[PDB]
Amino acid sequence: GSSGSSGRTVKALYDYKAKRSDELTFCRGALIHNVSKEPGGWWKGDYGTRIQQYFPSNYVEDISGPSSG
């Protein structure tokens, strides 16, 4: 049971490494789907072996959305 699903995506603008029990691992360029823009700071997304793991929004940029439309 889970309410609230989004298809947002973000790309890592810099290499990062999870140094805690609650963190996501990715390199510059990577992409994370299902981004839940939280009101606080850390967001929720999935990445490879990792799933719905907190990650620094300052190390990623939103890529999902209309570019030309």
DSSP state of 13: S
Across 1-69, the runs of DSSP E, i.e. the strands, are: 9-12, 31-33, 43-47, 50-55, 60-62
33 and 5 Cβ atoms separated by less than 8 Å: no
Q: In what order do the strands lie in the sheet containing 31-33?
A: 50-55, 43-47, 31-33, 9-12, 60-62
Any idea of the CA torsion for 34, 28, 65, 24, to the nearest 10 degrees? 20
* Residue 39 to residue 18: CA distance in whole angstroms: 22
Cα-to-chain-centroid distance, residue 37: 9
12 and 65 Cβ atoms separated by less than 8 Å: no
3-state helix, strand, coil in the chain (%, to 5): 5, 35, 60
Q: How was this structure determined?
A: NMR
What's the CATH architecture for 1-69?
Roll (2.30)
